[PDB]
Each structure stands twice: as structure tokens, then as C-alpha cells.
Amino acid sequence: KAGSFGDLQSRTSTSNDLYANTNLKLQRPQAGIVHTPFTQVPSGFERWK
Amino acid sequence: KYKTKVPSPVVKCCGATQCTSKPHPDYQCQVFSGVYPFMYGGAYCFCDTENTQMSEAYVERSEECSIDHAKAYKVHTGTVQAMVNITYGSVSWRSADVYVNGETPAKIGDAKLIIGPLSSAWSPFDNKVVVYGHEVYNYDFPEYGTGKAGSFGDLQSRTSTSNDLYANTNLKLQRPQAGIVHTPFTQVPSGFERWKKDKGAPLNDVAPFGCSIALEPLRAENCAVGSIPISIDIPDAAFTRISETPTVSDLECKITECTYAFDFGGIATVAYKSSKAGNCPIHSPSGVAVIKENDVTLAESGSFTFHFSTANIHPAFKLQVCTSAVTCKGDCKPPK
Amino acid sequence: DLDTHFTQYKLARPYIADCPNCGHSRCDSPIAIEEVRGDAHAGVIRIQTSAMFGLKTDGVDLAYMSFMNGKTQKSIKIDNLHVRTSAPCSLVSHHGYYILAQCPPGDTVTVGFHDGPNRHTCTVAHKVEFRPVGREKYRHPPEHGVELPCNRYTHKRADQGHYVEMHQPGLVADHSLLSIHSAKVKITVPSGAQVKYYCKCPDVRKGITSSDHTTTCTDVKQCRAYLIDNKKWVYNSGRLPRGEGDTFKGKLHVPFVPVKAKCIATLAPEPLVEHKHRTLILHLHPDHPTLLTTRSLGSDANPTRQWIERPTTVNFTVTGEGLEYTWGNHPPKRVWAQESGEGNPHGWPHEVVVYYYNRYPLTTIIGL
Amino acid sequence: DLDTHFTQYKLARPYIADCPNCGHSRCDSPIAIEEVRGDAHAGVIRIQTSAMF
């Protein structure tokens, strides 16, 4: 659910099946800075929390 | 923004000096009697009633003014022009620019351009429009001569270098006291700055017809409204004969299919036999099904297809090909 | 540079002033607060106090506060001053008399050099702000994203386009020179200090470098000892009496200059947007309030203005005329709304009735 | 304990990193900020930097 409520889309705690999407997208590292600028989704289920 | 400085406030042991018209905007000065102010490790600057304190003042201008100040305009009739691209006949991209006036004689290659002028006759502007930075704002009227209490005319000046401050910070002095050498006072806060908190939506952001503006000329940018009576000369030498041409015959076109969509979302073909092979244009005098094609080769028995969009659920129309207008009605069309 | 710095330092001296401190509402330190000026987009503050700082009185040792220690003038190390507004100040630099530091937002500066017996501090309330990130409401300047112009006091101290006149100093009353003659007053002048003194009778109100003393006031009380000086040159003020010297309009540069620089904020988060043909629904779950307008591309605008930070949504519809929209650093975009026919031209007569109801929304209805 | 501490310290070294400080937006200290983690009810924060401490 875009991670909106299914932030951890997994059968169990130990079920390491994350059928969830934080919609992680990278941005270009630049400015001579070694980094990984990016974007992704805030923890939506927490947002409901 | 303005600025406000203070000269040395006068002082004695007794008596008083005098306040003058030290020429500054909103400048003030007032004697102050029995001042009795002390100085650190001093002797109070008197033996008695000091009586000597002028609290002479001064108002001046800020320094951002250099970098940043108002840009208050009167906007007059002016002109319109525009750039085009011609890719005619045998000619490729020839992008050309010219003024709206229905007179402009402009020749590019063999194209003696004469343009418009445009049917429509307006752009959203105003005589009294101001601007900071990239932004720009119709200020109803910048009250130029009239000092607006500094509320917007905080720097009421013709230019940056025009040192004519017909503005009023309403500077008023208060009595220095408490043995403190100072010039307690009051004046107006930078009102135009106060609005620089209340800035609004720049006109470019409000300009309809989804079109924009250029900074230096106030060039409005492509609010595509109206019609343009253009007039262009062509190379009559670029012509050829009519009889030498591979001739049409055996006219028929198959309306394969179109769905009414933006892209030329309809394909249809022809079935035909030619006099002899070659090439020949297919103009759309009726651009109902907006043809992807405008000119195609015409091989012997040119029996081939093309693409086009019309909003129609179905037309029944026709258009031209190789100086031979043929009819392909236009089947029923799906939506998206 | 140093040459404009030496212009500053060649003929200017420190001084002190009764800075309205906060420990006991007032303080006469050389650290006397003045020249409060912070208006860069970074919120840096170029200031200066009653005393020369940064460089020593010659114009060297940027860590030598050429400060008016009491009556005298001194240049000691600038080893430790607590640079702190409401929060610890993000100090950058200084220049001699001038100081160019930055601070976080807040309202009150808390600064004073750690002399060791005292800070000699002077403190002043002045609300502090972070320059908002252009098109958006935020707190921090984003490390990357969208690059924007942003004003700033240029840290360079090599200026002479700006200037301040090192005014002729003036008068100073004193008490200590009026020693006792073992029976009455006894002036004691260090050097060239024509200290105006007036006991009960008129003494030399022109002042003396001599040790002259008059029995007209056996008491040292009425005796009004007043020094005058013009050694170096400082600019006058309201918190400065009418000094005898109304001269020395030596326009000494101010080092730094408010200049428009460029600095980078970050773009907005894209929203959720769904072409429910005949409309579109727009949903964003952002981290700060920006604004989105929606200006009609037709004969009108009818736009939107609003600022929201929290997960949100909205629906809208338009003709194929497109329409403006941009929330956050997002550029404006404009898209025709179509792919919505919603009607069958020919079915049953009741069907074609629903069509001549729907083929147009309303023109159908008025025609009907 | 110390034994897991010695597991930490036996074969690990410090380092530094260009921590985006606030004095001039960036800094290469061994104090390079990292491991930001505070989620206790007391709001305590267990962290760690580029260098052993």
C-alpha cells in the first residue's frame, strides 16, 4: 500500500518478504560530495500511528 | 530601505547651543535643558544645569538600495513580435522572427515575409507595474512624489542616485535623560519592507493562456490567441510544369480505422493504380482527420496508407492527393 | 585586504561605552555592543563594537582585540569569546573594529571575551531568523536540490566601496588627576592632558598639563577635571557626547559587503495524481508547507494559494485546456484533461437519450 | 561487559568523515556524526561516530 499502511509488507517478523514500496529513488551525488542523495517514502504505517 | 544616523549631540557645563535645519529627510533636533549627564570616570561635564543637548538627527538610505531597490514603472503601448519556423516545399527548418505589423517586409531565402498583424490586440499588462528580483507585480500606483508615510514609499526617490527623499519616517526625538548621553527618539519602520513581508503572486504566475513573460522588454511569451494575416513570397522558379508529372488514376482509399484521440490516432489506406511511379503531395484541404502525412511518394499503383486524428465519432469527409481530391469517409471511432 | 584594514587601524582607536548589558542592565566594556547588522540569507551578522577588535591597533594579529582597557587601550588575544545568540553563534570571522559572524535564529546575542576575570560581555535582544527557502517554508537550508540566489555579506574584507568616517574624538571628564596638596586639591597630569579643571573659582578651564591647584576649593569636589583627546579617531554617536573634535571625516572602509550569492534548497516531493477521466485527484504527503497554484490556461486563472505540510490530497478537473500547477520547488506543469467521452452515440432511443444527455455535460441538458 | 567490548576494539579502528558540520557546512573530524539513534521513552540516544570513542 505504497507503505502507507503496509510499510512492512511481511507475513511474519521472521518472514523476510517485503512486498512493500518505500518508493526509494536516488538523486545524483554532486558538489564533489561523496554521498547518495535520494528519496523514498516516510513510514506511512507510522504516519497512521 | 532607509537609514538613520546621529551626529554628536551637543553638551556644555551650562547654557545651550542651538538646533538648526541640518538638511536631511525627517531630520529633527531639539534643545534639552538641565541635562546633567555623567561620563565614566568623569565629572558630569558640568558644574550646574548643563542645559546643552541638541540631539541633532539625520535620516538617509540603506545600502541594499544599490543591490536591491524598487523598480516602479510606467508601461506604454509598445510592440509585439514573434519567431516562427518555416520548413516549406523543399526547405528544412528555417526559424524566423519578425514584428507583428502587417507591413514588415522580410526576405529569408525566397520567403518575402509579411506578417499579420494579429487579429487579437491585447496582452495582460498594466502601466503601473513594479518588480523585484525575477518577480514582478502590478503596483496599482507607486506613489512617487507623495510620501506614503514610508508605508510603501519608504525611499521616495526618482532613482538610486536621485538623492531626493520625499518620504517621511516620521522621525521624532525623545529627551535624553538618566545621565545617559544618547538621542532617544522614534521614527517609522521600513514600511515598504513591511510589505516585503506581504508580497503576493507575481503576474507571470497569474498570466492566463499558460504563457509567460520576458524580463527586459516585458515580452509576453506565446499566449497563443488570434489569427495572423501573413503574406510570403515563394520562388516561382521552385515550381515545375503540370503535364510532365506522373499522373493520377484509379482513385480509391480504404478507411482502415481511427479512434478519436489527440495523437493522429487513425490509420487508413488507399487502393489505386498510377499512370507512372514517382512522388506527389497529399494535402489536407479538410484537416478533419488531422493527417500525419502531407506529401508522399506515389509509386506505380500507389496503394498505401497514412495516419490522422479527428475528434469525430465518425466523419464522411475527403481531402486531396496529387492534385486529385479523393474521398475516404471515416469509419466509426473509439474513444481513448 | 590589509591596506583598507590599515586605513581603519592607522588613525582609529578603541573605546568603551555603557553597553546596556544583561548582568546588571548596563556595562561600560570595550565590548560595548554596537554596529548590530545581520541581514545575509545565511543570517551572518557583520558587527563592530566600541573597541577595535580582530587585528591589533596596527592592523595585524586578527586574534588581537585592540580594545580600550579602561581608560587605556590594549590589544590582547581574542583567545575566547562566547559567540552565542539564543543558541551558539555560527561565527565566521571579523575585521578589526568590524566583526562578521553568523548565528542561529533566536532573539538575544550573548557575547563577551573570556578575559579570565570577566567576560566584559554585552548582550542585546534582536529577533533572529533563518532566511526562508524561497518558494518553500522550511527551517534548514537543504544541502542540495534546487539552487537559488541568496543575499549575503561578502566575507571579503577587501572593500573600499563602503566606508565610515573616523570622526575626531572629543572631551573626557576625569576625577583621579585631582590629588591632594596635603592641604587641598593637587592636579596631577600624566602627559599633554590639558585637563579642564574648575574649582570654586575659575581655574584653568582651558586645562593644564601642569600640576596647578587652587585653594578656592580646598575640597576636590567642585574642581571639575576634564581631559580632551584626539590621538586616534572614532566615529561619534548618540551614545557619545558632543566631542570637541567635529573633524576627521576619514571614510574608512567597511570590510564586508551585502552581496547576492547563490545557494541551494531542495525540490518538493511529487504528489499522487490520478487521471480519473473527467477529473484528476492530487495527493501529496509532504514534509513542509509550500504553495501550489492552479491557474486556468483559458480566459481566466482561478488559481489556488495554500500552505500545508501534512499528508493530504485533493481532486480537480478541467477541459483539455490544460491547467497550471506546482506545489514546492516543482516547476509548473499544464496538461489537457481528456480521454473521457462517457457516452454512446447510438444505442436504443433511451440510450441515445442518455447520450444527448452526456455527449456534452450541460449543452446536452439545455438542448434537451 | 568488556569481552564484547574487546570484540569491538580488537580489530576495529577509528576513522574520520566529511561530517556536514554547521560551522562551515562540512567537517572531516573523527567526530564525524553517525549512528544517530535515539528512540527510548526517556529519549536517550545510542550513537557512534566515524572514530572509536
Curated annotation (Swiss-Prot), chain B:
Subcellular location: Virion membrane; Host cell membrane
Stretches in topological domain Extracellular: 1-336
PTM field: N-glycosylated.
Location of the region described as E1 fusion peptide loop in the Swiss-Prot/TrEMBL record: 35-52
Residues with attached carbohydrate: N85, N222
Highest taxon of source: Viruses
Its membrane topology: Single-pass type I membrane protein
Disulfide-bond pairs as recorded: C13-C45, C14-C47, C19-C29, C211-C223, C253-C328, C258-C332
Subunit structure comment from the entry: The precursor of protein E3/E2 and E1 form a heterodimer shortly after synthesis. Processing of the precursor of protein E3/E2 into E2 and E3 results in a heterodimer of the spike glycoproteins E2 and E1. Spike at virion surface are constituted of three E2-E1 heterodimers. After target cell attachment and endocytosis, E1 change conformation to form homotrimers. E2-E1 heterodimers interact with host VLDLR or LRP8/APOER2 to mediate viral entry. Interacts with 6K protein.
Function: Class II viral fusion protein. Fusion activity is inactive as long as E1 is bound to E2 in mature virion. After virus attachment to target cell via host VLDLR or LRP8/APOER2 and endocytosis, acidification of the endosome induces dissociation of E1/E2 heterodimer and concomitant trimerization of the E1 subunits. This E1 trimer is fusion active, and promotes release of viral nucleocapsid in cytoplasm after endosome and viral membrane fusion. Efficient fusion requires the presence of cholesterol and sphingolipid in the target membrane.
Protein name: Spike glycoprotein E1
Taxonomic classification: Viruses, Riboviria, Orthornavirae, Kitrinoviricota, Alsuviricetes
Interval of the full protein contained in this chain: 848 to 1183 of 1239
